[PDB]
């Protein structure tokens, strides 16, 4: 019955994305410098998230330290020792009073910023990979046991359990409307869910390997994907077809983190060639190389106002580029 | 004084060497997630046994890039289950994110192997040894792993075979000596001597 879907998508193929972007000038060369260098981490780090106030960020490391820093002064405001050394995700709440963490310990710990642990979520059988805050009451988590879960922190029980994946789920992204969220997994398929309906809406299969990162466009009607086959693809929600393939023949390495800017013109991606890339989201052309790390980049985050970007690799160094 | 309290904890990160344990269900990993700690020669080792996740291991094993050593324990008595151990050893040895660190190899329940052989591989017949039967069987089991371990990546990391049973009690000194040799070669590389 999917052959009819393929025929409908072939009939929907009117023109390429680059056919409609001909009548505009390209961006050109985009270069940045390391304004701040953060050296307070001992071991390798895995995850990072920017706050909504664009001043404080949080970094998660594998030595058991969750450090909330100050980006302006390059100094730590909080340093929490973790119960389990192995973590893979973190997120800083939009209200700024909470920060979450999770990893191989099968616990989604929530930390209050008003430092001790607030509550400990235990409903997942696999390792957590990505968690993001809807509000201060409800949180969406994803684990490697093919399950996403909507948690209510006030009761600590799952509201909706999203089970539509066959491979291990790596990342999720939140829409600006805070009503839908797209999630990517290790089965070359990323798909959209409704938090209210509790069911999948659309399924997108365009890649050839494991999806490692995903991010929404600022208008909420598109998303870019990053996978291990050294390619990126831009998908539209309404069209449900591949728009552009940001791929190069000189890269054969994986992609671990992607993020969008405020305008959405510059798609920022973290690769496995010990360096990040910036992409024109319309021209599908290379704009510049972000090479400042001695190890493989594991986290990458762009502020909402777009005035800075933070980037980390497993060499225990966080770098702000601007 | 937040940064002053971290540096002492830095010593707590540096004096302790972490170990990653694998194997199967039949191999005696417990008698040699789960966490254990043991101090030998006033040096603390802290060994991990991940057993709460799924059978797919191509993603979370990237968490163990910076661990000191991987203890791979192999069931040797049941001959039908060696080929899975060979395939797991080849996949571990040929991994991109695991090629720097080294594997200490334990071949468990040797007394059960002796009791079984005193009662699959077509190249066993044309093999000579480098109570006489058990030596040929043991070094066949050793050499089938060592041809994989010396097939590629010999310069970056090494394999340390060990023959042990479930009634052994001296594996702590042996893993201490293996870790001492591994970190000694790493220090000789780091100090511009070799």
């Amino acid at each position: 019955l999917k052959n009819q879907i393929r025929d409908a998508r072939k009939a929907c193929a009117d023109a390429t994305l680059s056919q409609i972007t001909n009548n505009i000038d390209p961006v050109g060369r985009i270069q940045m410098r390391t304004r701040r260098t953060l050296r307070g981490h001992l071991a390798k780090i895995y995850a990072m998230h920017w706050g909504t106030d664009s001043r404080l960020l949080v970094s998660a490391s594998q030595d058991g330290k969750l450090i909330i820093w100050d980006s302006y002064t390059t100094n730590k405001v909080h340093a929490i020792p973790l119960r389990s050394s192995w973590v893979m995700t973190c997120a800083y709440a939009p209200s700024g009073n909470y920060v979450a963490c999770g990893g191989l310990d099968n616990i989604c710990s929530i930390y209050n910023l008003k430092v001790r642990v607030s509550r400990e979520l235990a409903g997942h059988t696999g390792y957590l990979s990505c968690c993001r805050f809807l509000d201060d009451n409800q949180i969406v988590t994803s684990s490697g046991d093919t399950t996403c879960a909507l948690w209510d922190i006030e009761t600590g029980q799952q509201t909706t359990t999203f089970t539509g994946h066959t491979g291990d789920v790596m990342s999720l992204s939140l829409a600006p409307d805070t009503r839908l969220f797209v999630s990517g997994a290790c089965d070359a398929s990323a798909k959209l869910w409704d938090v209210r309906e509790g069911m999948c809406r659309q399924t997108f299969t365009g890649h050839e390997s494991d999806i490692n990162a995903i991010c929404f466009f600022p208008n909420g009607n598109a998303f870019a994907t990053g996978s291990d086959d050294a390619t990126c693809r831009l998908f539209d929600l309404r069209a449900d077809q591949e728009l552009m393939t940001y791929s190069h023949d000189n890269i054969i390495c994986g992609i671990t983190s992607v993020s969008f800017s405020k305008s959405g013109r510059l798609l920022l991606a973290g690769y496995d060639d010990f360096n990040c890339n910036v992409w024109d989201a319309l021209k599908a052309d290379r704009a510049g190389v972000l090479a400042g790390h001695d190890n493989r980049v594991s986290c990458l985050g762009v502020t909402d106002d777009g005035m800075a970007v933070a980037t980390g690799s497993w060499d225990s160094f966080l770098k702000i580029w601007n | 004084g937040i940064e002053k309290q971290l540096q002492k904890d830095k010593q707590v990160y540096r004096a302790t060497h972490r170990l990653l344990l694998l194997g199967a269900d039949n191999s005696g990993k417990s008698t040699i997630i789960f966490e254990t700690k043991f101090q030998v020669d006033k040096v603390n080792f802290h060994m991990f046994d991940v057993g709460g996740q799924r059978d797919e291991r191509r993603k979370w094993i990237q968490c163990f890039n910076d661990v000191t050593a991987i203890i791979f324990v192999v069931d040797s008595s049941d001959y039908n289950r060696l080929q899975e151990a060979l395939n797991d050893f080849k996949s571990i040895w040929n991994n991109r994110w695991l090629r720097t660190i080294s594997v200490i190899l334990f071949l468990n329940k040797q007394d059960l192997l002796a009791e079984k052989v005193l009662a699959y591989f077509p190249e066993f017949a044309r093999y000579t040894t480098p109570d006489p039967r058990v030596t040929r069987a043991k070094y066949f089991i050793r050499d089938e792993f060592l041809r994989i371990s010396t097939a590629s990546g010999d310069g970056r990391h090494y394999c340390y075979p060990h023959f042990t049973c479930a009634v052994d009690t001296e594996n702590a000194r042996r893993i201490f000596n293996d870790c001492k040799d591994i970190i000694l070669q790493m220090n000789l590389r780091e100090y511009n001597l070799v």
Partner: nanobody, 115 residues
Framework: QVQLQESGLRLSCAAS????????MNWVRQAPGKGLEWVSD????????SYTGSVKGRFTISRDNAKNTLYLQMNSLKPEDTAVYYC???????????????????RGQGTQVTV
């Protein structure tokens, strides 16, 4: 969309939806009453070829990129070979763990072969 379809005594596995000469492919079998077991592997260049010792020196595994399919040739069969035969692919290109797994996303549904 990735899709692996088996047929077949010569086995033919058809692969589509992804680039063919950048992945290392595997053959695995599922005999009833037990778990899965690896049979043979083939690299991108077709040079590094290994087999299980129980079936070594008997089977002929091959890959052609122009036809975009994988072939396996059998002679002098045994009654122990009655199993379901999956063609598998470990996911990382230019390189391999989870092909012998309970649930996998890059292998077919398999065909039953009995002598």
């Amino acid at each position: 969309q990735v899709q692996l379809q088996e047929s077949g005594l010569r086995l033919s596995c058809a692969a589509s939806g992804f680039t063919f000469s950048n992945y290392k492919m595997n053959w695995v079998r599922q005999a009833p009453g037990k778990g899965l077991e690896w049979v043979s592997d083939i690299s991108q260049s077709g040079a590094s070829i290994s087999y299980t010792g129980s079936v070594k020196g008997r089977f002929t595994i091959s890959r052609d990129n122009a036809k975009n399919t994988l072939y396996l040739q059998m002679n002098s069969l045994k009654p122990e070979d009655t199993a379901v035969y999956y063609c598998a692919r470990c996911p990382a290109p230019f390189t391999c763990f989870d092909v012998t797994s309970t649930t996998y996303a890059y292998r077919g549904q398999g065909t039953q072969v009995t002598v």
